[PDB]
Coordinates of C-alpha atoms and ligand atoms in Angstrom, one line a residue:
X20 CA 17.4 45.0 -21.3
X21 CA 18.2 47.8 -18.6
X22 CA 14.8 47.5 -16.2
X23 CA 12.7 44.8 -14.8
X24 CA 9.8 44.8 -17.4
X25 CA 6.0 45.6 -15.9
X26 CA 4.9 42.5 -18.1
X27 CA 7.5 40.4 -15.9
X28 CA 5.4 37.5 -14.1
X29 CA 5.3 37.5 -10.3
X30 CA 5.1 34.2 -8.5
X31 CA 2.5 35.5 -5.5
X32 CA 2.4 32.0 -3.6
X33 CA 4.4 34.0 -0.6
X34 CA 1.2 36.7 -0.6
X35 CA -1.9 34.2 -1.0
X36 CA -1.8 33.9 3.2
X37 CA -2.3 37.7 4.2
X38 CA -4.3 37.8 0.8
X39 CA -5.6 35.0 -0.1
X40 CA -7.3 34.1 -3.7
X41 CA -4.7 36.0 -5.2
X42 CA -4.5 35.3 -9.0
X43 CA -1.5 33.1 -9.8
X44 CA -1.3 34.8 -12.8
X45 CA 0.2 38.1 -11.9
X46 CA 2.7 40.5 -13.1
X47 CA 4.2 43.4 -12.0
X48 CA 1.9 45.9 -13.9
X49 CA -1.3 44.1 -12.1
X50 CA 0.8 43.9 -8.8
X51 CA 1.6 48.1 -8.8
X52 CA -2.3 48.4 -9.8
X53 CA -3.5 46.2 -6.3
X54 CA -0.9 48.4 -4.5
X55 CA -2.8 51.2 -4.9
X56 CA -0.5 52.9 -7.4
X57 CA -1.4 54.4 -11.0
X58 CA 1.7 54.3 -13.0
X59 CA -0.6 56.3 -16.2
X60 CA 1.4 55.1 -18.9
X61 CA 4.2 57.6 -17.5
X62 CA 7.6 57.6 -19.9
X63 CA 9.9 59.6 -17.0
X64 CA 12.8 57.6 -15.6
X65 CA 10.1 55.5 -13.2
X66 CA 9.2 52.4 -15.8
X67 CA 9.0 50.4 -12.5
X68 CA 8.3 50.5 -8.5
X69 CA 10.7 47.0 -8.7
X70 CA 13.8 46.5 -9.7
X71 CA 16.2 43.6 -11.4
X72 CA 18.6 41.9 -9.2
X73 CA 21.6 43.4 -11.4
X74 CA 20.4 47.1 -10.2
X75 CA 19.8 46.1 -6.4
X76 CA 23.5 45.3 -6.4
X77 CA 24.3 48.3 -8.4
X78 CA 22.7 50.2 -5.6
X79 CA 23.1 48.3 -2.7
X80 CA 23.6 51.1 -0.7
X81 CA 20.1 51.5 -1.0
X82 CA 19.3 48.8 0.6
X83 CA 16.8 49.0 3.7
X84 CA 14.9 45.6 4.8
X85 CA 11.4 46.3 5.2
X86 CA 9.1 44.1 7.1
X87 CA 5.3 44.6 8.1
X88 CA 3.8 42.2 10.8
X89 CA -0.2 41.8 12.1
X90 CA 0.1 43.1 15.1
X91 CA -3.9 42.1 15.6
X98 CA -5.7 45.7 7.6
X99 CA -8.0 48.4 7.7
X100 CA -9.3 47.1 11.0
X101 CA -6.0 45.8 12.9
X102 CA -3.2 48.2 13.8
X103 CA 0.2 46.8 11.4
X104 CA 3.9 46.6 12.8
X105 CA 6.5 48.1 10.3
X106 CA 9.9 46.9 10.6
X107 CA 13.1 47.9 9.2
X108 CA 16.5 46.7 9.0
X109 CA 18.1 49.9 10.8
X110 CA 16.2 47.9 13.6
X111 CA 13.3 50.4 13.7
X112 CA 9.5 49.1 14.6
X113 CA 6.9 51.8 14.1
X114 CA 3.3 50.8 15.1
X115 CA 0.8 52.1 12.7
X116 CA -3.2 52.1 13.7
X117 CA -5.9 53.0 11.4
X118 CA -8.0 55.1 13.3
X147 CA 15.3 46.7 18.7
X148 CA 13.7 49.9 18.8
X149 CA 9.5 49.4 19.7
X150 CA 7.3 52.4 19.5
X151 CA 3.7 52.0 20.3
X152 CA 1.2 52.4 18.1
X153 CA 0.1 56.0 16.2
X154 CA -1.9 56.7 13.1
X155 CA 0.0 56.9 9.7
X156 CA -0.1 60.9 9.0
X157 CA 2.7 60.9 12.4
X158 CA 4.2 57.4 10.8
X159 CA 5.1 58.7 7.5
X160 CA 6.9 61.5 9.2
X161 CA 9.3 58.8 10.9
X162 CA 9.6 57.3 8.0
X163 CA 11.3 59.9 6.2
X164 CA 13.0 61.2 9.0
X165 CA 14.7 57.7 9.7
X166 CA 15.4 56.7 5.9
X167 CA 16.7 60.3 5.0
X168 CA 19.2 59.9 8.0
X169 CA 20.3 56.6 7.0
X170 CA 20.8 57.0 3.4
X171 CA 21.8 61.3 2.7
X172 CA 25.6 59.8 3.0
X173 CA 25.0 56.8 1.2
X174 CA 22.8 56.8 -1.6
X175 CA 20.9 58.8 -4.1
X176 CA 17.5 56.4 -3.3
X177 CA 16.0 53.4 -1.2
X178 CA 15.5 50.1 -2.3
X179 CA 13.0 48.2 0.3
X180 CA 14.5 44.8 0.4
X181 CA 11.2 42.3 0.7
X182 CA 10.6 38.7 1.7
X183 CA 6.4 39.4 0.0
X184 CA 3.5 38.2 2.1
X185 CA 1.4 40.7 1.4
X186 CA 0.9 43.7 4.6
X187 CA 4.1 45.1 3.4
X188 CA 2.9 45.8 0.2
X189 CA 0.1 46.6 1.0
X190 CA 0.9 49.4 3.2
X191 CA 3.2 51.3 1.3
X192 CA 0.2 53.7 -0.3
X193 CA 0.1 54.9 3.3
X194 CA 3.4 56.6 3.2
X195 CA 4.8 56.3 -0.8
X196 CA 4.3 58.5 -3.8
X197 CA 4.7 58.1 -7.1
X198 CA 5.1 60.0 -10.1
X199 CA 7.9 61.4 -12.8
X200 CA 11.5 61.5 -11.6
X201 CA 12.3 64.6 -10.0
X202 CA 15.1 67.4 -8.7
X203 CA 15.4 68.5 -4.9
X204 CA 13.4 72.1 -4.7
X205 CA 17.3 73.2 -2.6
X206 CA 19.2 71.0 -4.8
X207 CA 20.5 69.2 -8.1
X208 CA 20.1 65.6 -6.7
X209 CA 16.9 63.3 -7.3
X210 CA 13.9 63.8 -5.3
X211 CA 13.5 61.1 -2.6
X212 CA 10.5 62.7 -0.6
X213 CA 7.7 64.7 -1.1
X214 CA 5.8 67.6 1.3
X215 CA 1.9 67.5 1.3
X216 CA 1.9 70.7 3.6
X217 CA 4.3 72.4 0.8
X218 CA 3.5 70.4 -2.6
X219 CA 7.2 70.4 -2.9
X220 CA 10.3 67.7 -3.1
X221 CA 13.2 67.0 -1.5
X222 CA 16.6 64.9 -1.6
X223 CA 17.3 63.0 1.4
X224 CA 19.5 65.9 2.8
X225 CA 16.9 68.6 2.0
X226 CA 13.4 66.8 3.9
X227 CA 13.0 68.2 7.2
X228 CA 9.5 68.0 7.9
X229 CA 8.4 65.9 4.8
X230 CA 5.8 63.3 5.2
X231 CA 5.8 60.8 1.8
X232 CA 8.8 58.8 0.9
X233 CA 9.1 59.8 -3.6
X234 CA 9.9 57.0 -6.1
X235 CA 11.4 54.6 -4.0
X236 CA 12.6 51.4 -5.7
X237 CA 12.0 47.6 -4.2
X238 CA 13.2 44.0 -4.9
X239 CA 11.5 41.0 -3.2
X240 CA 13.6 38.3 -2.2
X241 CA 10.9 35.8 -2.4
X242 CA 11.1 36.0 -6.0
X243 CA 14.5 34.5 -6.8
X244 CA 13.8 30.9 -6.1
X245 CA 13.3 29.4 -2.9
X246 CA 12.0 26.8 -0.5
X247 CA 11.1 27.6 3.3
X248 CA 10.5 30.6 5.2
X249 CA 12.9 33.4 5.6
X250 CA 14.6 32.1 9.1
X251 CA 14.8 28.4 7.7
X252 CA 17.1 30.4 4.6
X253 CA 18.5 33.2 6.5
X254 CA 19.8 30.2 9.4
X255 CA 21.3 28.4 6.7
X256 CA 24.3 31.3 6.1
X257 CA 23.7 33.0 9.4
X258 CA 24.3 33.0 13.0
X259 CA 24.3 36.4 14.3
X260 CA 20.8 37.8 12.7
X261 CA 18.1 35.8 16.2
X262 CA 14.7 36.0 15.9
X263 CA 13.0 38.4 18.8
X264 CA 9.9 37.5 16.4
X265 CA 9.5 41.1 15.5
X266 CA 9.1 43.1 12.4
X267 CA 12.7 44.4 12.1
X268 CA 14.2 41.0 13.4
X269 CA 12.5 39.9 9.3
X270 CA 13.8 43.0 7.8
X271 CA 17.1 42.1 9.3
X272 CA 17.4 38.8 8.4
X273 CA 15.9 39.7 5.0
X274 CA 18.5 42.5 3.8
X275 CA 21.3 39.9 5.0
X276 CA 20.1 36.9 2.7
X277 CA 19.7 39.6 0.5
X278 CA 23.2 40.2 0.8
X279 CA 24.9 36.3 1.1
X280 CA 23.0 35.9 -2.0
X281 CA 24.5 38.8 -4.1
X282 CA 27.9 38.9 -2.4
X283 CA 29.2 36.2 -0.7
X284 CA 28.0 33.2 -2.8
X285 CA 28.1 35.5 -5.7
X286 CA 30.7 37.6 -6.4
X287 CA 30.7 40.7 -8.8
X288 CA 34.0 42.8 -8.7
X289 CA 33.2 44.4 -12.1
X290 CA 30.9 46.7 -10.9
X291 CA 31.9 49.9 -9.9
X292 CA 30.4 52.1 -7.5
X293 CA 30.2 55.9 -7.0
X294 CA 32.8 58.2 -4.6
X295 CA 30.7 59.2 -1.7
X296 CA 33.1 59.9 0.7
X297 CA 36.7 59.7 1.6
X298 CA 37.6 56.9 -1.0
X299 CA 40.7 58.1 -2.9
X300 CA 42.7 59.2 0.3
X301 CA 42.1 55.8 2.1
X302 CA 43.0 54.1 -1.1
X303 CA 46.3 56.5 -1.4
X304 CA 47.3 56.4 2.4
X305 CA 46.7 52.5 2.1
X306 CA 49.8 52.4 -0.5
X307 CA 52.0 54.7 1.3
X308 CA 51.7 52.6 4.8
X309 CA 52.5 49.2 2.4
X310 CA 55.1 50.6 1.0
X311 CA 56.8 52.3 4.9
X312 CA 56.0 49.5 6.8
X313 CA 57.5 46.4 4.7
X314 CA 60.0 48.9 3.2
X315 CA 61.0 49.7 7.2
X316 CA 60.8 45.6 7.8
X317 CA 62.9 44.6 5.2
X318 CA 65.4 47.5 6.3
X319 CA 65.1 46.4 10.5
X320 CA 65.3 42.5 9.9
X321 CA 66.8 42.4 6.6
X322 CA 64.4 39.2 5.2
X323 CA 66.3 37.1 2.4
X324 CA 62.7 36.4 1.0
X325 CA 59.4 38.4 1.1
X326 CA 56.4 35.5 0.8
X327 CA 53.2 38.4 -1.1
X328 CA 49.7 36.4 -0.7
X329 CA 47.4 38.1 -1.4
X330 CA 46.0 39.9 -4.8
X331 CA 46.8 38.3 -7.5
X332 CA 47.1 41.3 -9.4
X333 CA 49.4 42.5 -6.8
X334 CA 52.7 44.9 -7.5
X335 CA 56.0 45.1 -5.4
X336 CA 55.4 48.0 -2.8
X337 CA 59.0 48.4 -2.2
X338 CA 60.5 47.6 -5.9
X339 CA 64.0 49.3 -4.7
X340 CA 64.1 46.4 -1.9
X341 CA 67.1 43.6 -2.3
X342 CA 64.8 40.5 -1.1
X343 CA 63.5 37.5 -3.1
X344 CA 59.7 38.7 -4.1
X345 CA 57.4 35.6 -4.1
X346 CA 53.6 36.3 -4.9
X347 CA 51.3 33.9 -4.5
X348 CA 47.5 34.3 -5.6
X349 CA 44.6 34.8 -3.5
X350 CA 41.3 36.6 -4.6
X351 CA 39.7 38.3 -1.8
X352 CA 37.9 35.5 0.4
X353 CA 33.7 36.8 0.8
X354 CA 32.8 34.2 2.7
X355 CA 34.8 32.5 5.6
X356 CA 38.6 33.1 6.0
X357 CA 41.2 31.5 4.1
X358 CA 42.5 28.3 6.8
X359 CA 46.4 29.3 6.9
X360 CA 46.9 25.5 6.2
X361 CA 45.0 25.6 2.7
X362 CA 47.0 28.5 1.9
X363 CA 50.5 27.3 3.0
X364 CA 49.9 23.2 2.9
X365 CA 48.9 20.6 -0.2
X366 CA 52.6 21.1 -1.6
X369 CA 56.7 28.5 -4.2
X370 CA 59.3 28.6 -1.8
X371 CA 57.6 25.8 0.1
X372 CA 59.5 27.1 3.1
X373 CA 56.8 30.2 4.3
X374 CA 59.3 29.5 7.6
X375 CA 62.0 31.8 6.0
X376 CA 62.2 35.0 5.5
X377 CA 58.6 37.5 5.7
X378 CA 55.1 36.8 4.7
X379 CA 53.1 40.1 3.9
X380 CA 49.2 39.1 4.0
X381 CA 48.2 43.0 3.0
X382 CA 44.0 42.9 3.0
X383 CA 44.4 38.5 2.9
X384 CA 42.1 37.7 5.2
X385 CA 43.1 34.7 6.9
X386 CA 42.2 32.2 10.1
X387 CA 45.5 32.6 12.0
X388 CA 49.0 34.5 11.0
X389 CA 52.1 32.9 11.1
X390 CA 54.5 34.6 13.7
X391 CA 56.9 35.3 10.8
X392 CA 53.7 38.1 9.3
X393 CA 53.3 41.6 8.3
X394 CA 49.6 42.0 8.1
X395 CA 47.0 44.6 6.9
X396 CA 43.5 43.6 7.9
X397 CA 40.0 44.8 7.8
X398 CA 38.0 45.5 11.1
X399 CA 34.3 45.0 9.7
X400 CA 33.0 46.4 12.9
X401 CA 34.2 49.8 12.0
X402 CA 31.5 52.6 11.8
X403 CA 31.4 54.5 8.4
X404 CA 29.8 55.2 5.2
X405 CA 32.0 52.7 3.1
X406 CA 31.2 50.0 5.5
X407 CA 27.7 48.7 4.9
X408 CA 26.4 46.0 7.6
X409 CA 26.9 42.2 6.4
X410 CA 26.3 38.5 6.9
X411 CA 27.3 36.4 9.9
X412 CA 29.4 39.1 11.7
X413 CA 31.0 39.9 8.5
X414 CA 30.5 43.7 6.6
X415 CA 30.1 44.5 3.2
X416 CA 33.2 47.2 2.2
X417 CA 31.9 49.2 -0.6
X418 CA 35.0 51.1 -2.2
X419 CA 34.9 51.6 -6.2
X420 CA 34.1 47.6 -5.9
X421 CA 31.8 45.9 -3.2
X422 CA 33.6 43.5 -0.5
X423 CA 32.0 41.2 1.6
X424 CA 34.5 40.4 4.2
X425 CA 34.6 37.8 7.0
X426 CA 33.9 38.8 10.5
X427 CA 37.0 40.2 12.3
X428 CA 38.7 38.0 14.3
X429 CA 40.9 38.9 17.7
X430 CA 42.5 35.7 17.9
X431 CA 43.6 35.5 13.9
X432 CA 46.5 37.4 15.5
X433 CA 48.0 35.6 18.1
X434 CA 51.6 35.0 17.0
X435 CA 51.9 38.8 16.1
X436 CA 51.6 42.3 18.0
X437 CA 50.4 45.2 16.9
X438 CA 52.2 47.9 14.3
X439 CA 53.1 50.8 16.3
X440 CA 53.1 54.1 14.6
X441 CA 56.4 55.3 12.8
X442 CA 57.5 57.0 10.3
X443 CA 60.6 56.2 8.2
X444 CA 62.8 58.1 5.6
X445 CA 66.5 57.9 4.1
X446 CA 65.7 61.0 1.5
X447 CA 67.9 63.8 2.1
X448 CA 67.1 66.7 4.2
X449 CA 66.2 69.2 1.7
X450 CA 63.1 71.5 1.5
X451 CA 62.5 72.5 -2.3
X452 CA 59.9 74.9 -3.2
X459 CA 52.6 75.6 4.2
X460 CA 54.0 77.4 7.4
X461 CA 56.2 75.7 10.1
X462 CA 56.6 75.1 13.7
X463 CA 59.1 73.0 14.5
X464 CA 58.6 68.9 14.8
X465 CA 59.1 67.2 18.0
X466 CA 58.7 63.3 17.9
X467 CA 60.6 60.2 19.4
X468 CA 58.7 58.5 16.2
X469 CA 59.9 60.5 13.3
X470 CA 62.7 57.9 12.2
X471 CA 65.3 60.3 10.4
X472 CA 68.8 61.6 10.0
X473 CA 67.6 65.2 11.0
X474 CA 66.1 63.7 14.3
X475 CA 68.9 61.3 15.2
X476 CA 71.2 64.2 14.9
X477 CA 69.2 66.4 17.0
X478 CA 66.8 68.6 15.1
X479 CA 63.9 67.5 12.1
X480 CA 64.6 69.2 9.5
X481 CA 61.8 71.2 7.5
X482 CA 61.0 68.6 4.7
X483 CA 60.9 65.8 6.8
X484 CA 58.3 67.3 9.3
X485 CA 56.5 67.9 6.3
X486 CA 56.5 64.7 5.3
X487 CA 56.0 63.1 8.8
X488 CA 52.6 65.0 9.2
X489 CA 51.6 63.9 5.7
X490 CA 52.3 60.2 6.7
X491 CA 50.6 60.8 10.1
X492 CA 47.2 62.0 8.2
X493 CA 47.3 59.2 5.8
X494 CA 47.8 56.6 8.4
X495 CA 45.1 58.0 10.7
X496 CA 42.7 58.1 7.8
X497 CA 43.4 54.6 7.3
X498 CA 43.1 53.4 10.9
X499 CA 39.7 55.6 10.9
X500 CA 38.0 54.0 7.8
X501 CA 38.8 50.6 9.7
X502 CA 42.4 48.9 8.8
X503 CA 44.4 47.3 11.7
X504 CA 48.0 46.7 11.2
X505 CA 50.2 43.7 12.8
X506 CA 53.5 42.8 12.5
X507 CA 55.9 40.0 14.0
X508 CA 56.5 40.3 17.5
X509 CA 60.4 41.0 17.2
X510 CA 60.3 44.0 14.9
X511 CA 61.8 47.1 16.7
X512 CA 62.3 50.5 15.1
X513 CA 65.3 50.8 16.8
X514 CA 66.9 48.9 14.6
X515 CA 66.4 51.1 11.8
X516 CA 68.3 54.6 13.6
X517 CA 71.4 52.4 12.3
X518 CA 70.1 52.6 8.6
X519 CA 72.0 56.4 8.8
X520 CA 75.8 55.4 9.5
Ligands
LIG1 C1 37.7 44.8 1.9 S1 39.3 44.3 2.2 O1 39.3 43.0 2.6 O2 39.9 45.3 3.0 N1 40.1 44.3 0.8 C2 40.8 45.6 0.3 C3 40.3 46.0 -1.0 C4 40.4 45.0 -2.1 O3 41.4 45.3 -3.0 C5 40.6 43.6 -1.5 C6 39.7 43.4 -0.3
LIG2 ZN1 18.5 68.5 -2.0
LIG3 ZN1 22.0 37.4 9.1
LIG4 ZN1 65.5 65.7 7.4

């Protein structure tokens, strides 16, 4: 039990209106056959053009939405929509191009996929809501055949020149026309009633309806992806490093541990209130303060309401001392907060676009997180950059010029002149906590904290 079977059945009442009489009885073996494709009993890593539900979230990078629409079939030109909100026109002979014959189409096609996924994905999975055109039309710009290498590189071949009989990975196809071995999943198949709007609605309010091809492919990948991680939710699985993973996830537990440890130092808290994680460690284990931790799994939905959290009868008294919400997603901060939270409008390759203004956050696990929220942070202002250090001024064991900053928060600069290992050190903590406000963090803290009050920390 690894891949979908060929002898799985297919439920084709979705297809019977843009191809009506269409068997009942169908499987997937039948269904690749009507498609136009010849899989010739072929025992090469390709058992199957469709995929399990299990691998679509495995690769869920993958994912593109792909819609076709009737414009007017052989004889009527087809509107092919994807979920990067690209509409290509294809004759037989947002963005809307008009209509072209499929030998320029394909060309587009790989072009656009190859741009969207080199950074994220070693393939495409077309995410389908089945009636039939969509299917249909994928002989006029897929091949199929054995798995394969890149002719420039080691990666799996995505695409595949006609003009050069050769193959390509999706950073290697300039200029190649057929998208190779792609993988699909249709929607359709996993149970349920109504249209795709009627469904997509029910979880969604940002995805409209222009009534257009990618408006469907849209709406289609983000069911896709309420269904698999937000109502559903699989922290087990782990996902490849494709980027910058390990230093976010490193500069993430260095600002923790300066920021509370620099709170704790400024206001001196009797009690630190941790919700959050519940497999959550004290960043500052040195600290005096009273650790509380209270568990909260990371919410995939809506935000946690503050007074589900906090009310319903722990210190009781969240009103004393600090509360540190570090990735806890919640509806409105108490003034007394130090908060770490996820901007899902952030542009990057972790951040994968999700379901009703919320993103799907794909870093060694997948996280569907609520839509970022301005007014979550009303009592509190925003962390300004600092750094803090009480280690002694001592090199031990990279070529200098020397550190000027009002915001390197050491005994060295309050008497005058930053010493060597602490400019070091500054510059390291300014690179992790720029990486960390580039991959999409913000950080807010309550609005009397003052790093003034920590030059006092050195008497
Ligand atoms: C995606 S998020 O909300 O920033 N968050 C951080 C990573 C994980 O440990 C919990 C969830
Ligand atoms: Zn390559
Ligand atoms: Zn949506
Ligand atoms: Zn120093």
């Amino acid at each position: 039990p690894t891949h979908l079977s060929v002898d799985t059945k297919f439920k084709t009442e979705g297809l019977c209106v843009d191809i009506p009489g269409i068997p009942k009885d169908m499987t997937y073996r039948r269904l690749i056959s009507m498609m136009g494709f010849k899989m010739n009993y072929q025992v090469n890593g390709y058992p199957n053009m469709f995929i399990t539900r299990e691998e679509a979230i495995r690769h869920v990078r993958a994912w593109i939405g792909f819609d076709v629409e009737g414009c007017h079939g052989t004889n009527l030109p087809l509107q092919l929509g994807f979920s990067t909100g690209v509409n290509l026109v294809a004759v037989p002979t947002p963005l809307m191009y008009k209509g072209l014959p499929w030998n320029v189409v394909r060309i587009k096609i790989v072009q656009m996929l190859s741009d969207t996924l080199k950074n994220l994905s070693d393939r495409v999975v077309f995410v389908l809501w089945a009636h039939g055109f969509e299917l249909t039309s994928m002989k006029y710009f897929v091949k199929i055949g054995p798995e394969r290498t890149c002719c420039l590189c080691d990666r799996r071949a995505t695409c595949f020149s006609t003009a050069s009989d050769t193959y390509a990975c999706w950073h290697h196809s300039i200029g190649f026309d057929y998208v190779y071995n792609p993988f699909m999943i249709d929607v359709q198949q996993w149970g349920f009633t109504g249209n795709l709007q009627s469904n997509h609605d029910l979880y969604c309010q940002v995805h409209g309806n222009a009534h257009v091809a990618s408006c469907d492919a849209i709406m289609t990948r983000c069911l896709a992806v309420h269904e698999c991680f937000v109502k559903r939710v699989d922290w087990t699985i782990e996902y490849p490093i494709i980027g910058d993973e390990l230093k976010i996830n490193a500069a993430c537990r260095k600002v923790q541990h300066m920021v509370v440890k620099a709170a704790l130092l400024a206001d001196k808290f009797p009690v630190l209130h941790d919700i959050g994680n519940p497999k959550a460690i004290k960043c500052v284990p040195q600290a005096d303060v009273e650790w509380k931790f209270y568990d909260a799994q990371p919410c995939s939905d809506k935000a946690y309401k503050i007074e589900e959290l906090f009310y319903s009868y722990h210190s009781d008294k969240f009103t004393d001392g600090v509360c540190l919400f570090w990735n806890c997603n919640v509806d409105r901060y108490p003034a007394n907060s130090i908060v770490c939270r996820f901007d899902t409008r952030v542009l990057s390759n972790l951040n994968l676009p999700g379901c009703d203004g919320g993103s799907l956050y794909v870093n060694k696990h997948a996280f569907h997180t609520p839509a970022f929220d301005k007014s979550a942070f009303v009592n509190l202002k925003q962390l300004p950059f600092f750094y803090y250090s009480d280690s002694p001024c001592e090199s031990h064991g990279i070529d200098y010029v020397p550190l000027k900053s009002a915001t390197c928060i050491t005994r060295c600069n309050l008497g005058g002149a930053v010493c060597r290992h602490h400019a070091n050190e500054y510059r390291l903590y300014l690179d992790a906590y720029n990486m960390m406000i580039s991959a999409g963090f913000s950080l807010w803290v309550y609005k009397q904290f003052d790093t003034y009050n920590l030059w006092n920390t050195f008497t």
